[PDB]
Symmetry: D2
Subunit: 351 residues, 4 copies
């Protein structure tokens, strides 16, 4: 059906020096951010810092090709705004600047392989729209342009190994649909094509170490399902497979430094669950639980030494995190620790 | 729930010279058999030949370690009987000889790695029972002995790569359960352990080319699901995965000569469907259909040159087959051809 | 150059019940054999038993498709003779029967996938010759027939996964050459083709679990080298790779029950060395040594529970063996133990 | 022995927008550079542009974590100097700035995973020395510090998947030696350890998509050899393997967008040769030749759409290039095309 599983409560990015930095919306409806002081999971965090301005979406973040983080959000009148570091690895930001338009989803940002950011969002006519940097890592943007379709989830964009951006979204029939650049980093796009099934979360996309994209989503029966490219184009995919175990949030996927995939999701008992590929391309482990009730989907990242780190909303409405203790992929994990200073709200547009 | 998907209509074996031979039950309630005259899929078949005697199960067949085929069936009073070739690759059979007992499933036969046949069946108390050759390829059998449990499907047995027989069956809770030799070819067995889930077919088991067993079955939502060993013991398995596509028979699995798995099943439109692993351990292709409505599950085998061949019941109640045209695993396939002479009935005990 | 590294001192086969049985030539110039009483590496051995008759080659053995072992040897006048078990798993043998011809290598036997044994040997004109069973597992043989070429090593034959026999031998230029059935189990053969390089041992061939043959041999610099099929035909192969470490015998290859390859050879210090694939298709481990000076190449086999076992000639001129302690492929190993009763000689024709 | 195979004639880097840029030494002994105008292999090139100043090494280049290219070279008095783009993707450079020291190899630069450049070179005492940025992408450098050893080749540095820099060099015994950070991006280093063998080129290092480093080098018999990590630490490696085919330059390695490795080297006939992995981890293809005699080792890079591109010195002493025609990894290749404007010299210090 048409449910959208609970989103992650923050977006995360690595800075130019790989320090992790998180962005979320507080009770004042402003975006706040916090960062590691050094790029290791046991680092202190700087503390929560506000960007002035009321917002009405989850903030999206990406690192420019010159190392500067840039954040995208929706304003009260549904326009898109963006902020950026004015130099890499520095806490001096531009404050919010306008890209106009009217959007009806969270904004989603991807980096073209020619160094230009590109933003995707659902529009007021429910089509997919996009806007892009016209020169790499420069505040020079295109006009808005439509890619059509009818969307019923937030979009997810990811670059193929050959540099073609590909965008995924739920359609009017609740199936997963996708559309792609047919030449890398150009405004030449395919038609929409359906990958069928029914999904009940936003899609989540990752690249494998054989150059094939893989998509994860919750399905109609509330279990995790996934599908992958089988060749070196966007057209031909595997069948869908679902894994046993009811999940109650969007999934978050990560490729560990051994090249194998891991997926995290809130489980049926409202704790964080993890599953991983036990061999090349499969199969998948039984889900393993971490202690503690959580109140959002996980958001996952990797530190400068490869260690996986996970962020979640706690029952105190604050952000908590845990991580791998060693770069070994069968390393033990820490238990939830607080990143205190503010509490957060779920501003995701499509919920 | 407690449905058991339609079974295959014949069992099949390779003779000592790899000629295929099929066994099924005709309208007279007798077992009839037919064989290739030469071990190639385009060979003529000898014609259907009767074993005298009324039976009340699907016949099971296995090749002894001396090359002689041996068939196991249930009689009207629920006892087990067996017949054998008196020399490899010859049509001179022993006629039915008694192993007594009382069984309430189809008999299932496996070959120990010390060359002794072993037969498994559900008993009159719904437990798993077994009986075995006490010397390899010899008509000298043990007494019947119980392995306990409560079974609600026919059993499926397969040997691990380390020589330990492992038996799979649906239990009273409709989950997949299993039990195993703890030392190869000995009467030292584990306790029953559940692999969970719910299955609505008999389980079907195959060995991968990394030494790991994999089990296929139809699930509660009538799609194919599968699970595999993740290590080099019987205890630790993957999570279950289900593949999209409703199936309407038991599946049949085969390892092609490139070492990759293929599964065949009757689909939702009552045609034969096939899916295959597109890479090592996964993922799986979309199902592909063959033309023609079929009236049983497929039974699958491989010829002396590796070519896959599939048998099914047609709407005329006769046996049909098709095969790969070349030893290439992306070879085209023939269309259904008749193996005429008799018509067949489904004598499977648990249906 | 034209050296041929020291051969194994026995051939070995698994009986129908998987008991290991070894064949070698004693100081009386007769073939003697010995066998496990039960199919486990720690089993007692029956004791050494003689086949009457003087021989002038290493004996070759293969199991027929009806489970009966059959041995091939050369007589004083260079004719081929064979002996067989008259029933599987029994010590009642036919005594030596004539196949005539004149051969100038050790005989090499392979089993076609239609159940017919086929023997290859160098002839008096240095070409490759062959002779075969005309019906599976029957004492009915063809006439001798030439496959041409010029051979400078003993031949090695192995069946492809699609049932085509392929034969390998060193040629007049000291390179590895090969020739193959172009249809499985038929007398339709390719032309000779060179795989180039230079080898200084007989070639040793094994099948991988993706259906590709791989060939091992000592090279000109006395290190192990190997080459593999890259597709699903006999024509297209990889480049050669050599592994560091000087070896002083023929290698012996085995596929462990995890599907990975291991190679054993006498090393530069005259001890047994082993190397194994640390991942799928590679790379290879550093050689690991077993304690004890040895006086032949290893001969390797697998027991009914998958455990690898190795046989060698000791400095006392008797046969010794060691094995894996568990079915785990990183299991510890036993130390050399004697299979006493006779001493052995190297009767290999081409040395 | 102590030969060092011919080096590449340029270094290459991707700009922040992925445009390729090459650096080499002309007949005036100055560094000149040239770049793609757009990041595609069929792009025009801007033309050759000079950095004023006489140099006495091959120039090394790396992209900072803020996207700015930075070049390292030796001056007449053997000191290290560096130049950088003052903004990403712009042709406004700092001109040469001093890092002093005295070096006796080409400088080699690597990027730590905390965004700090680090430079390695042989010193006047033949030990390995290093110097580093003390803050990411900032002109603030450490003092020089020794890592000891005795070097007889230029060093090669590469980051492990867990963020630890590892450095490779030939030692006084002509073997490959290595040393590594024991904590990522810290000045805590291991002792030197030997990987044995004998190499007759500089080592060339790449990371696989399972997180394992692999090293290529020419060996004593002038063939390509390679060795790889087998676990997730720096300590345990495979045996060495050599591939047939005599090579007459350093090799250049690249990971294609399907995750498989390819190696290029000048061959025995003075043409460019290529070999590639035909499966996961192996084996390797026979070498394939491109038409045309070449006068240096290849330098290899990848374009924004994944396409591989190769640079070489021609017999006219100018730079030529060729590339893949499509993002397919079995795509055809172009033939050599000139990047004209200057001629080049081999300034590599250790030759
Ligand atoms: C620029 O156009 C405005 O913004 C787009 C993103 C769409 O919502 C469109 O319907 C709207 O008119
Ligand atoms: C082009 O197709 C349109 O857009 C897709 C994204 C889907 O919503 C589909 O149902 C709709 O008709
Ligand atoms: C030998 O025992 C008989 O046969 C077994 C297979 C069981 O059905 C048992 O209950 C029955 O009494
Ligand atoms: C040992 O457990 C028993 O047998 C199994 C095969 C299952 O039927 C289970 O429900 C039952 O209690
Ligand atoms: C049957 O022919 C005889 O045996 C063959 C195996 C060859 O040695 C041939 O030269 C010889 O004449
Ligand atoms: C067909 O070629 C012949 O036989 C091969 C086996 C090689 O000995 C070769 O040198 C010889 O000319
Ligand atoms: C800073 O030290 C100088 O430069 C180093 C790189 C070494 O060559 C050293 O011997 C020399 O004295
Ligand atoms: C620490 O060891 C020293 O440095 C290495 C790099 C080698 O040159 C070795 O021969 C030398 O003794």
């Amino acid at each position: 059906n048409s449910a959208i599983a609970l989103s992650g409560i923050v977006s995360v990015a690595n800075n130019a020096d790989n320090r992790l930095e998180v962005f979320g919306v507080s009770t004042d409806s402003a975006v706040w951010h916090n960062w590691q002081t050094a790029p290791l999971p046991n680092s202190s965090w700087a503390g929560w810092n506000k960007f002035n301005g009321v917002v009405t979406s989850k903030p999206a973040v990406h690192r420019n090709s010159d190392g500067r983080l840039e954040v995208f959000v929706r304003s009260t009148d549904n326009a898109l705004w963006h902020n950026w570091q004015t130099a890499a690895d520095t806490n001096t930001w531009s404050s919010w600047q306008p890209l106009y338009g009217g959007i009806t989803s969270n904004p989603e940002v991807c980096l073209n392989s020619d160094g230009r950011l590109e933003v995707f969002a659902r529009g007021t006519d429910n089509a997919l729209w996009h806007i892009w940097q016209t020169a790499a890592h420069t505040n020079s943007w295109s006009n808005w342009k439509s890619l059509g379709g009818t969307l019923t989830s937030n979009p997810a964009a990811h670059i193929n190994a050959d540099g073609r951006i590909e965008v995924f979204a739920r359609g009017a029939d609740n199936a997963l649909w996708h559309i792609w650049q047919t030449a890398a980093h150009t405004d030449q796009w395919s038609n929409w094509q359906s990958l069928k099934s029914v999904i009940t979360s936003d899609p989540v996309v990752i690249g494998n170490c054989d150059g094939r994209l893989e998509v994860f989503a919750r399905g109609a029966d509330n279990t995790l399902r996934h599908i992958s490219q089988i060749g070196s184009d966007s057209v031909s995919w595997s069948n869908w497979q679902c894994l046993d175990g009811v999940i109650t949030s969007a999934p978050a996927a990560v490729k560990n430094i051994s090249g194998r995939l891991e997926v995290f999701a809130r489980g049926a008992d409202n704790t964080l669950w993890r599953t991983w590929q036990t061999s090349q391309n499969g199969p998948w482990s039984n889900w393993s639980s971490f202690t503690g009730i959580i109140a959002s989907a996980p958001t996952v990242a990797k530190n400068s030494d490869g260690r996986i780190e996970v962020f979640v909303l706690g029952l105190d409405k604050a952000l908590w995190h845990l991580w791998q203790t060693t770069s070994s992929t069968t390393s033990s994990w820490t238990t939830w620790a607080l990143i205190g200073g503010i509490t957060l709200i779920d501003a995701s547009v499509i919920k």
